[PDB]
Amino acid sequence: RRQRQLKKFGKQVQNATLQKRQLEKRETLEKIKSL
Amino acid sequence: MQLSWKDIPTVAPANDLLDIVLNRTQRKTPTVIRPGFKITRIRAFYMRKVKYTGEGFVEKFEDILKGFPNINDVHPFHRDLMDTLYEKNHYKI
Amino acid sequence: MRQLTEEETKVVFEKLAGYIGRNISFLVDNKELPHVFRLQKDRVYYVPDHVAKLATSVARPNLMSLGICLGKFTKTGKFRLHITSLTVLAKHAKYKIWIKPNGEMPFLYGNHVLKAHVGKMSDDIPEHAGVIVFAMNDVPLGFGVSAKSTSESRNMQPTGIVAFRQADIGEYLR
Amino acid sequence: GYRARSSFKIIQINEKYGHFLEKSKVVIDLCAAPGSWCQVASKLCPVNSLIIGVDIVPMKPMPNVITFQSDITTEDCRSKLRGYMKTWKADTVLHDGAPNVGLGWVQDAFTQSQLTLQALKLAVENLVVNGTFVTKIFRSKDYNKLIWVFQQLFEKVEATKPPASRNVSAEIFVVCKGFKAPKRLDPRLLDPKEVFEELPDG
Amino acid sequence: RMITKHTFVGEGFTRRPVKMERIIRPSALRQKKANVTHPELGVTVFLPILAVKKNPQSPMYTQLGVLTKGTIIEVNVSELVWGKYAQVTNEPDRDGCVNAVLL
Amino acid sequence: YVDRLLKDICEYFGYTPFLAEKLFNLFSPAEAMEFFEANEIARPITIRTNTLKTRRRDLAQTLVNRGVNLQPIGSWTKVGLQIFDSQVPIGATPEYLAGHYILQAASSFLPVIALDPHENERILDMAAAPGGKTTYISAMMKNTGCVFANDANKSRTKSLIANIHRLGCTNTIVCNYDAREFPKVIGGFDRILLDAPCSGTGVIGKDQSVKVSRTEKDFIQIPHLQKQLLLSAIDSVGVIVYSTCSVAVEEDEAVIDYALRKRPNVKLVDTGLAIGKEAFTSYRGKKFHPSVKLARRYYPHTYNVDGFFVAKFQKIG
RNA sequence: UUGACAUUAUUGUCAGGUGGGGAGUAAAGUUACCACAGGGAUAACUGGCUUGUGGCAGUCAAGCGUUCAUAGCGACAUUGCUCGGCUCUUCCUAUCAUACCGAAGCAGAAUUCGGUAA
């Protein structure tokens, strides 16, 4: 059940984690640019 | 050296000096490379250009330094004569 | 601070019996300074008897280290042996290996022991038994699991391992 | 991790000649344009050796090594050893004499054979009794003439060309251990005019 | 794998990598003095870097000392109102030096 | 004229007026040519040869064979080796890592030279940050009895747990404490050692933060803190040693002179062993001090050390 | 386990410290520090490529900003410190020499820069 779920939603895991990382990049950079 | 100094390579006014050394590196070195080449040929291309411009400016600077008479090492008359005609401190600056 | 259980000592004494042989009887029976060992936050510490007896007043958060640290118990339930043990270990070594003065600093950066050093090692060494690395002055450098036996490691090409690095004294730069 | 490949052929010459550089305190180094002779004179001689280098090129100083960077044939640089090495006399005297090779080979070997006598006259002036004199010299027409004047001014003269040389180059490292240090030196002997006076026909 | 980005390494380099087994950082890519400008007074003071604090994009890079655009670094004020931290503005992989602005 | 020199310190060195004025009053222009002109030397390279693993006469050969210029300092101990010229790395030599010697300053020797550790006894501690001095505790000891190690910093214990195990002391209870509430923890009857929790902090060649960023507020609360630490040191025992790395009076010989009156059980014995100049009586409108003669002094220019003060105490009842 | 008190080493009390060792009302969180085995997702296509003048911050500042300089972008300058090599054929000019010119304190000679030029 675990590995089948990983093969079904592996793509979405990749792109979600990457875009969340870039969201965190812009979040930190805004937290510097405000000050 | 001895009594007189007419034999000095000319001094470019620092804007034209740039236009001599930088244009020579554009004309004398190869200038065309694809991005699709090997990384080794791309590296060697730009290395060859940085180095060649390096030798360019150095060659022109060495001509000035060796060309002009070493004021305090020539002769007491000439050391002082150049000191009278030109601000000796600024000549050494 | 706490006292070890029956199994927890056996796990330590076996790992110490990997490098020291059956000469582990030197380590616990002294009668003058019997040298009991305790652990704080899952990491064993080797000390004199009374120096741990009077330090039972220190708080667990307030405590940092106690004498000579051997190593820590892993989350899985094994026992690691840290480099700080060597001051106790090399005094009672069984299988001992030396190195080149030239090929010393490669070892001191984390690399393994190559065959490129030939001389007088210990004899009767099994393939996977714990060896202790010495460097003139017999300076202890660290631990090691042997790569081959003494017999096999003599007829070898000089770029093959003779002792896998485990911990070296270069860890004192961190 | 040395400076040049010329470094690996004196540490090789010491082992063959009883580690003479190990016992030696003060060293006069000649013609060392890289420091491939003073580095190995630092790792062999005892601490605070005080070794002095002379070379025609002006270049950097090295830690624990004093080095004067000017002419070899003048009297003023001889007054720079007279400026320093009058109180102490050198235990050894090194010679990595080499010209800018690539002109006929006849002269590329004879300006070498000329240079070694001028290095000899800086050596015969400033060497301790029963020291040594190690020399790079090319095999040539006038090599047999140099080994003879070595033979009558030193105790034991032994040529080598050790391993870790080029094997194709016509180098010889000849050592001259034991120094006479005479009170009466022959003046017509040491001058290069009489040294290369050619042998008469048969 | 080797890093082809410009980094700063602290002076305890000799046996520092506990957790950096084969992370090669060549000596050519190590820039020690950031070309820092002062905001409130338009003067640029070329000062040595003390500590790499917070590199965005990667928290690996914070532990490696990578100096990509947006990295907050610590500046030595030995030469000397001043702010101890500076944020980098250039991409030192492309141009020569590291250019930072104080906070 | 004084203000000329005060303009030739605060501009020439780039220095604080608060410290330049407070370290020139009742000090000669000769002494101004001693202290102020010595902050370019920056700690001469001495070494502490660990007597446990090797004797010094067997360690002189070890570094010289690798081409290190070595010479002992004056009279104190053969342990201190002055390094002049070395190319072999000055911290990465296998003998550093072995624990044959630790790299120290010359000022790091003497607060434990003054202290005299004996066999089987316990030594207590409050603030030993690197652990270079606790080495000299547990080497004269020859690994017997108890040795406490302490500092009030969780980050700086890593230097202690590095150096203790590096040099092999075996008898170390290195534990983080608050130094004030220390007699309530245990209060061991045998001797203690305290050193430099200081705001005056001498020799600016080490830390140039002193050069710019020392105001009066540091001199208010830090001398008060180290004052209370004496009141915990005299409540441990038995030969107390309290020292600091500061030439300013508000750190030594005003802090020690408080605790002298505050308990009648306090005696100041002859502190150092070899040399070190005589101590003053008057400290710019301060009390009578014929008892405070023995607390030694050291200067950065009279000798090649880093200016500091030692005060060794004795307790009776 | 430390101090105080008494017994005047031994023993008691009190007070101070530790104390999932026992009595009463174990193991778990985390991981881009991450090291090894497994599953995913693609990497590496001139979309006229390439050349001589850096980057960061500020100073100006043609205008445009949805009106418009106070929603902001902003060129040239400027100011801050700092795999190698042997041999031949053909082609390109971004030409080292030969040919002709222009500028240059170019007296003559020699030269420097530049133009046409394969």
Determine how many CB atoms are found less than 10 A away from the CB of residue F315: 19
Number of residues that make up chain E? 103
Type of residue found at D152? Q
Cβ-proximal residues to D41 (8 Å cutoff; 6+ apart), any chain: D21, D27, D29, D49, D51, D65, D94
State how far Cα E95 lies from the chain centre: 14
Which DSSP string corresponds to B3-60?
A: S----------SSHHHHHHHHHHHHSS-----TTS-HHHHHHHHHHHHHHHHHHHHHH
Nearest beta carbon to residue F92 from set E14, E78, E80: E14
**Sheet strands side by side (includes C68-72):** C37-39, C43-46, C68-72
**CB spacing of D43 vs F67 below 8 angstroms:** yes
Going F246 to F252 to F254 to F255, the CA torsion angle's sign is positive
Q: How far apart are CA C26 and CA C19, in angstroms?
A: 14
How far apart are the C-alpha atoms of C105 and C99, rounded to whole Å? 10
Identify the residue whose tokens are 């303009």. F7
Q: Under a CB-based contact definition with an 8 Å cutoff, are residues C173 and E16 in contact?
A: yes
Task: Give the type of residue at C18.
Answer: G
Instruction: Name all chains with 3 or more CB-CB pairs below 8 Å to chain B.
Output: none
- Asked whether C138 and C130 are in contact (CB, 8 A), the reply is no
How many angstroms separate the first and last alpha carbons of chain F? 52
Residues of D belonging to the active site? 136
Burial (CB < 10 A; 0-12, 13-18, 19+), residue B32, is exposed
Q: In sequence order, which residues have a C-beta less than 8 Å from that of residue F149 and are 6 or more positions away?
A: F125, F128, F131, F134, F160, F164, F172, F173, F174, F175
Task: Centre a 10 Å sphere on the Cβ of residue E3 and count the other Cβ atoms it contains.
Answer: 16
Q: Which of F272, F96, E59 lies closest to C139 in space, CA to CA?
A: F96
Q: What angle do CA C73, C76, C80 make, to 5 degrees?
A: 35
Distance C37 CA to G19 C1' (A): 18
From residue B34, give the alpha-carbon distance in Å to each of B38, B46, C20, F21: 9, 13, 65, 69
F193 vs F171: CA distance, rounded Å: 16
- Cβ-in-10-Å burial (0-12, 13-18, 19+) of E19 comes to exposed
Chain breaks in chain C (C to N over 2.5 A) after: 135
Q: Which of residues 43-62 of D touch F (CB under 8 A)?
A: 43, 46-48
Please check whether residue D95 is in contact with residue D13, taking contact to mean a CB–CB distance below 8 angstroms: no
D55 is known to lie in a ligand binding site: yes
Residue C117: what residue type? H
DSSP single-letter state for residue C136: -
CA E98, CA E90: separation in Å to the nearest integer? 7
Please give the DSSP secondary-structure letter assigned to residue C73.
B
Around Cβ C125, how many Cβ atoms within 10 Å? 23
Phi-psi region of C36 (alpha: psi -120 to 50; beta: other; left: phi over 0): beta
Using CA coordinates, name the residue in chain A closest to E71: A29
State the virtual CA torsion across C5, C8, C10, C15 in degrees, nearest 10: -160
| Rounded-to-integer distance, Cα F193 and Cα D73, Å | 67
* Structural domains in chain D, sorted by start: 5-196 (3.40.50.12760)
Beta carbons of D56 and D70 less than 8 angstroms apart = yes
With b for 16 or more beta-carbon neighbours within 10 A and e for fewer, the B42-79 pattern comes to eeeeeeebeeebeebeeebeeeeeeeebebeebeeebe
Contact status, residue D174 vs residue D158, Cβ threshold 8 Å: yes
Say yes or no: Cβ of E95 under 7 A from any atom of strand G.
yes
* Residue linked to tokens 């004093």: D66
Mutate which of E47, E80, E81, E82 to test chain F, going by most F C-beta atoms within 10 A? E80
All residues at 6 or more sequence positions from B29 whose CB lies less than 8 Å from its CB, including other chains: B48, B49, B52
Q: What's the DSSP call for residue E38? A: P
d(CA F303, CA F296): 14
Residue closest to D129 by CA, chosen among D159, D96, D155: D155
Structure tokens, E86 = 């500076």
Measured distance CA(D91)–CA(D114) in Å, rounded: 24
Report the run of H or E that residue D159 belongs to, with start and end: strand D154-159
Resolution of the structure in the document, Å: 3.3
d(CA B57, CA B46): 17
Residue among F239, F274, F241, F244 at smallest CA distance from F78: F274
Whether any strand G atom is under 7 angstroms from the Cβ of E96: the reply reads: yes
Q: Which phi and psi angles does B79 have, rounded to 5°?
A: -55, -40
Please give the helix or strand (H or E) that residue C87 lies within, else none.
helix C86-89
Residue C44 pairs with which residues in a beta bridge? Answer: C39, C71
Q: Is C64 close to F62, i.e. CB distance below 8 A?
A: no
The shortest C-alpha distance from D88 to chain F (Å) reads: 21
- The structure tokens 């190593």 sit at C71
CB atoms closer than 10 angstroms to residue C156? 16
User: Residue E50, SS3?
Assistant: strand
Binary contact (A32, E57; C-beta < 8 A): no
CB D157 within 8 A of CB D150: yes
**Structural determination approach:** cryo-EM
Least CA distance to F64: which residue of chain D? D47
Number of Cβ atoms within 10 Å of the Cβ of B1: 8
- Greatest pairwise CA separation for chain E in angstroms: 44
Nearest partner of D177 among D156, D160, D146, D147, judged by Cα: D156
Separation CA C40–CA C46 (nearest Å) = 11
Residue E32's CB is within 10 A of a number of other CB atoms, namely 10
Number of neighbours of residue C1 by Cβ within 10 angstroms: 16
- Enumerate the known binding-site residues of F for S-adenosyl-L-methionine: 127-133, 151, 178, 195
Smallest CA–C1' separation from C42: which nucleotide?
A: G27
- Nearest-angstrom CA–CA distance, C115 and C138: 19
- Let me know: does F46 contact F80? Beta carbons within 8 Å: yes
**Separation of alpha carbons B68 and B62, rounded Å:** 10
Q: H or E element: which one contains E74?
A: strand E72-75
E·F CB contacts under 8 A: 7
CB proximity list for D145: less than 8 A, separation 6 or greater: D113, D195, D196
Q: Residue C147 in contact with residue C161, Cβ under 8 Å?
A: yes
CA max distance for chain A: 48
Residue D167 to residue E71: CA distance in whole angstroms: 56
What the block records as the tokens of F315 is 């307790």
The answer to whether D175 and D133 have CB atoms below 8 angstroms apart is yes
**DSSP letter (8 states) at residue B79:** H
- The DSSP result for chain F, as a single string, is -HHHHHHTTTTTT---HHHHHHTTTT--HHHHTTSGGGTTT----EEEE-TTT--GGGTHHHHHTTT--EEE-SSS-TTBEEE----S-TTTSHHHHHTSEEEE-GGGTHHHHHS---TT-EEEES--SSSHHHHHHHHHTTS-SEEEE--S-TTTHHHHHHHHHHHT---EEEE---STT-TTT---SS-EEEE---SS---TTT-THHHH---HHHHHHHHHHHHHHHHHHTTT--EEEEEES--STTTSSSSHHHHHHH-TTEEE----SS--BPP-S--SS----SS-SSS-EE-TTTSSS--EEEEEEEE--
**Is E85 in contact with E75 (CB distance < 8 Å)?**
yes
* D121 close to D190: Cβ distance less than 8 angstroms: yes
